Design a protein around this ligand. Sequence first.
Ligand SMILES: O=c1ccn([C@H]2C[C@H](O)[C@@H](COP(=O)(O)NP(=O)(O)O)O2)c(=O)[nH]1
Ligand SMILES: O=c1ccn([C@H]2C[C@H](O)[C@@H](COP(=O)(O)NP(=O)(O)O)O2)c(=O)[nH]1
Ligand SMILES: [Ca+2]
Ligand SMILES: [Ca+2]
Ligand SMILES: [Ca+2]
Ligand SMILES: [Ca+2]
Lengths: 223, 223
Amino acid sequence: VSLSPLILRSLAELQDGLNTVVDKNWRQLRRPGDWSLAITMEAAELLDSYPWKWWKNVKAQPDLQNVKIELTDILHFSLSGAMQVSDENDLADFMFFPLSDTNNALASFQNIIRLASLQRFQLVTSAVIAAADDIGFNLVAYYVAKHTLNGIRQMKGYKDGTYVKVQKGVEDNELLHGCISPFSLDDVTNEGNYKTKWDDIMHRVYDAFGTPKEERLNIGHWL
Amino acid sequence: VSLSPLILRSLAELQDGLNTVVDKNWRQLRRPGDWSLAITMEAAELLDSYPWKWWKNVKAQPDLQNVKIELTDILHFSLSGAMQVSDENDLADFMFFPLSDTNNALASFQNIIRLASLQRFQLVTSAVIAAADDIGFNLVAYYVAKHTLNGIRQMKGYKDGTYVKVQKGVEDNELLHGCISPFSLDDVTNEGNYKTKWDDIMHRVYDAFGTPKEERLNIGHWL
Ligand SMILES: O=c1ccn([C@H]2C[C@H](O)[C@@H](COP(=O)(O)NP(=O)(O)O)O2)c(=O)[nH]1
Ligand SMILES: O=c1ccn([C@H]2C[C@H](O)[C@@H](COP(=O)(O)NP(=O)(O)O)O2)c(=O)[nH]1
Ligand SMILES: [Ca+2]
Ligand SMILES: [Ca+2]
Ligand SMILES: [Ca+2]
Ligand SMILES: [Ca+2]
């Protein structure tokens, strides 16, 4: 399972743009080990979406909507890693389907950590794409939506430590589900029209956070 | 750097006792992969004690007192793993001193994750002992104190999901520092008298959480 090369290239361009918002010279400041750490930490967040602890709240239920967000976060970091180092610098060995089985999920997502530490970023990207295919969620649409939230966060003091993620019982991430649900897989991968659908996802996320029109960045900013 | 074999054996006995409080048949219910996951997750907590994120709160300061707690948590899980499988089933390659350097810490603590996934539990234990020696904190006293909090947690609904860790701005873990500060390294490792000092640490932690005298377990319960 893979995305069209043109779609992947566009996702990579968005990722470079976002990385540039965080730091103009990110390509000189960041190293492969940074992306390995970042993926490791998101993978811990992904694992913590499951009731894996045998000693604490043992009847807890998995947060399967959150799984989607954490996989999307991993993609941002695996795209980033791949921009800096090639894998040169197999999947069915590390991923176990169906991921609806919690034991399969825990094993697979721990293996993402192994792959990250090996700096196999392209393989991590493939693993996330395969996971979204297996779980049956719209990875590309989640990416565009979380990409947009990531930019909003930077606009609202994230680097300064003044941003608050959970407000009035709602985490910013949770608002993304509703922003994406109108969009099909074909909407966001159509060769001719995908960019207008990505632009539409972006506008929906800006709306969800009340971003003033003048501060909004459209799809053209990123490509 | 290592502990006396008699001290290590006593720490292992405490650990078995605690594991038994969580489940009477833990030795049949738990598998090596459980302990690998648990250490991985504590190592993420340890890494998150440092200002590693380049995109969020970039001027944050490391929580060096919390580092002590997270290393102690790793020890509980590495002791546990070692009870189930041997390493048969080197350190200077994986740990980088001094750990006061944040780059050394991030590299080292990520390598603890690699060792956990390899089920090298004894090596993880050695790494924690070496880390406490390098940082200069009283690992054995931290272990006894956190061991006691772990038992209190189980008494107060931890498995049921009714426990609250942070109350009136104070995390339960933070109260342990004051419980241990009177105790020297020699106090808690003295061949003849260490058990009375461990018992004293326990009584201090029970006091810190107001545990009724009848619910308190003394050192003899565990050895
Ligand atoms: O140079 C960077 C730094 C961060 N991120 C994004 C990717 C990921 O989607 C998000 C993770 O941010 P976080 O601060 O860990 N918060 P959360 O996991 O709740 O989204 O940050 C980037 O895309 N590039
Ligand atoms: O079978 C078990 C399960 C847990 N723990 C202990 C070890 C560790 O000290 C603690 C971690 O608990 P947690 O629920 O992750 N909470 P925190 O990391 O804040 O202490 O649980 C055990 O000793 N044995
Ligand atoms: Ca995160
Ligand atoms: Ca996340
Ligand atoms: Ca923990
Ligand atoms: Ca911990």
